[PDB]
Design a protein around this ligand. Structure first.
Ligand SMILES: CCCCCCCCCCCCCCCC(=O)N[C@@H](CO)CSC[C@@H](COC(=O)CCCCCCCCCCCCCCC)OC(=O)CCCCCCCCCCCCCCC
Ligand SMILES: *[C@@H]1O[C@H](CO)[C@@H](O[C@@H]2O[C@H](CO)[C@@H](O[C@@H]3O[C@H](CO)[C@@H](O)[C@H](O)[C@@H]3O)[C@H](O)[C@H]2NC(C)=O)[C@H](O)[C@H]1NC(C)=O
Ligand SMILES: *[C@@H]1O[C@H](CO)[C@@H](O[C@@H]2O[C@H](CO)[C@@H](O[C@H]3O[C@H](CO)[C@@H](O)[C@H](O)[C@@H]3O)[C@H](O)[C@H]2NC(C)=O)[C@H](O)[C@H]1NC(C)=O
Ligand SMILES: *[C@@H]1O[C@H](CO)[C@@H](O)[C@H](O)[C@H]1NC(C)=O
Length: 549
């Protein structure tokens, strides 16, 4: 019942197969037998497809596979056996897969990878995923023997009971290691074994409240780790300080991320300057998303973080209930160039303290997207302290109408006012602008002369008339989809002499011929410039298809 295309890609997915279909051929390049009910794979089921490159067997109900089932798949590059019922793995399955690049064994109920190294013959392996949520409980030294370099290694071990020291040490290089660990018990041992190989370590769902640092029993070496991320972790202010002590081993770390974590303030954590980490090495990017701090009144005089972020260039603290960045802290972020405080609780009065006289000295880009700002004039006035600011994003803030006169940072060339509920644009917006986004608002027209404007985004508004071409003599990009445009003045787009891209779709274009002639002809001569396709109101026919005699 399977169907193959002309390139040997065959689909046998979501059938009710209870066994590998018979009559497979050497012409098959890809076989998808996922979501079936193939309980057993025998000695000869896959012997005929010797040229197979891709074999997907996800979520079928495989519980038994004969040891030599893959003997003729010497050209196989992708094998997905994830989410099946394999409670035991056999080294025999992989012995003949010399061309294998991707192997997914995750989601099967085995407790360990077995007593025999499974991957020594997989010399070309690039991606390996293993483990499960409830049963994988031990990682052994023999587990990764034979593997030298991997682009991605994912180990799901939420129920881990034991990690044999040095298990991960035999791997020479790992570009991205993803570890699902529920407890911090083996973190020091694991960390010690990946110091020479891992370039990006990602730790998921780890409760690190009990984590405590101790120098590692390993020889000194230059670690290639550049990125470290924690996803869904639980920390205490004390354990966080302990984690920072690991930085001494990863001197090239440049980026750190904390997503969906929770930080608990002990309330007794009174560390001396001796045990407190105040240096952050070469970390230049810090990204925090959805951080939950239960009781902030349980933290001490957090001034150590001031010396911690002095060299950081990019900081993101998104959707974490931030309502204030104290002035003294802002003054210490001397190297900061990009600051994103999207989806927080910032209001003008507190932003005024956050952006005090010498705050964020080097700042070039400030994102205050989804906050509680109400006045564009007051916001611009407050930000005059940021002398080097060139880009400002205040989108998704509910602003009252803007006035005719406003003060803004002198170098500001980018301003995002998308989704701010504005009904009119006034001269509050400066002529220094090169990029303006006023999309998703309630605008009925646009008449602002912005001589240096290179990009205008005004999609999702209520314009019934295209803004005058003379308003943007050097415009490169115009986005005006989803408005209420029915026509355009003859020759208008040819007057946008620098135009490179334009979005005109989702508008009720009137394709009656003694009117749509110019637009249809322009679209035919400028297909490269159009993004999306303008369609006629009613028929839904592409505007370009219309030809007026
Ligand atoms: N005086 C007052 C007394 O309480 C302060 S007002 C409190 C404000 C201040 O919030 C601020 O100072 C935020 C300013 C924005 C920039 C923060 C950068 C911090 C990065 C974290 C270090 C990264 C190191 C990585 C190393 C590998 O928060 C507030 O506005 C109210 C409290 C809500 C939460 C605020 C954000 C919490 C920041 C915690 C930082 C540590 C996170 C650890 C995660 C595991
Ligand atoms: C961020 O913006 C600030 C703007 O204040 C930049 O700092 C300012 O840099 C200028 C030029 O280097 C300094 O002006 C100089 O003042 C002396 C007076 O002693 C004068 O003789 C010179 O002719 C010149 O006008 C100014 O003092 C300084 N502002 C401060 C901090 O007081 C800063 O360079 C920008 N950061 C980056 C990396 O873009
Ligand atoms: C002006 O600000 C706009 C509002 O933020 C911005 O549009 C938004 O751009 C982001 C970034 O791509 C989109 O985010 C999408 O991707 C993230 C991460 O994968 C998801 O979490 C989001 O749900 C979303 O799928 C937003 O969708 C998009 N908002 C919309 C609907 O417009 C503009 O790009 C900014 N203008 C300029 C010129 O930079
Ligand atoms: C891989 O298969 C070859 C087949 O000749 C076998 O000799 C070898 O032991 C297997 N794994 C190793 C150790 O390379």
């Amino acid at each position: 019942s399977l169907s193959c295309d002309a390139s040997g890609v065959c689909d046998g997915r979501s059938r009710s197969f209870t066994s590998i279909p018979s009559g497979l051929t050497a012409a098959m390049k890809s076989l998808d037998l996922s979501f079936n009910k193939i309980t057993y794979i025998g000695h000869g089921d896959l012997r005929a497809c010797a040229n197979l490159q891709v074999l997907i067997l996800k979520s079928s109900r495989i519980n038994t596979i004969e040891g030599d089932a893959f003997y003729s798949l010497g050209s196989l590059e992708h094998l997905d056996l994830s989410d099946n019922h394999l409670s035991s793995l056999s080294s025999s399955w992989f012995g003949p897969l010399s061309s294998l690049k991707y192997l997914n064994l995750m989601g099967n109920p085995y407790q360990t990878l077995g007593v025999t190294s499974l991957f020594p013959n997989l010399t070309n392996l690039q991606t390996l995923r293993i483990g499960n949520v409830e049963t994988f409980s031990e990682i052994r030294r023999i587990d990764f023997a034979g593997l030298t370099s991997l682009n991605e290694l994912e180990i799901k071990a939420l129920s881990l009971r034991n990690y044999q020291s040095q298990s991960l040490k035999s791997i020479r290089d790992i570009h991205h290691l993803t570890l699902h660990l529920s407890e911090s018990a083996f973190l020091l041992e694991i960390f010690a074994d990946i110091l020479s190989s891992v370039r990006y370590l990602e730790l998921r769902d780890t409760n690190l409240a009990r984590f405590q640092f101790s120098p590692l029993p390993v020889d000194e070496v230059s670690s290639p780790m550049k990125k470290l991320a924690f996803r869904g972790s639980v920390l205490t202010d004390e354990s966080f300080n302990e984690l920072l002590k690991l930085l001494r081993y990863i001197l090239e770390l440049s980026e750190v991320e904390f997503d969906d974590c929770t930080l608990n303030g002990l309330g007794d954590f009174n560390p001396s300057e001796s045990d407190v980490v105040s240096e952050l090495g070469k970390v230049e990017t810090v990204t925090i998303r959805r951080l939950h701090i239960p009781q902030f009144y349980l933290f001490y005089d957090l001034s150590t973080v001031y010396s911690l972020l002095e060299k950081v260039k990019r900081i993101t603290v998104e959707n974490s209930k931030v309502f204030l960045v104290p002035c003294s802290f802002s003054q210490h972020l001397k190297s900061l160039e990009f600051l994103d405080l999207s989806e927080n609780l910032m209001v003008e009065e507190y932003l005024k303290n956050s952006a005090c006289k010498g705050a964020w000295p080097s700042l070039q880009t400030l994102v205050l997207s989804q906050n509680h700002l109400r006045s564009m004039q007051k916001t611009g006035e407050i930000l005059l302290t940021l002398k080097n600011l060139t880009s400002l994003d205040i989108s998704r803030n509910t602003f009252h109408p803007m006035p005719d006169s406003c003060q803004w940072p002198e170098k500001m060339r980018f301003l995002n006012l998308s989704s701010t509920g504005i009904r009119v644009v006034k001269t509050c917006i400066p002529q220094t602008l090169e990029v303006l986004d006023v999309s998703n608002n309630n605008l009925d027209s646009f008449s602002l002369f912005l001589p240096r404007l290179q990009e205008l985004y005004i999609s999702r508004n209520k314009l019934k008339t295209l803004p005058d071409a003379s308003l943007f003599p050097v415009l490169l990009v115009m986005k005006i989809s989803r408005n209420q445009l029915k026509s355009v003045p003859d020759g208008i787009f040819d007057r946008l002499t620098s135009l490179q891209k334009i979005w005109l779709h989702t508008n009720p274009w009137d394709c009656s011929c003694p009117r749509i002639d110019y637009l249809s002809r322009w679209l035919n001569k400028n297909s490269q410039k159009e993004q999306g396709s303008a369609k006629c109101s009613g028929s839904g026919k592409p505007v370009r298809s219309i030809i007026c005699p």
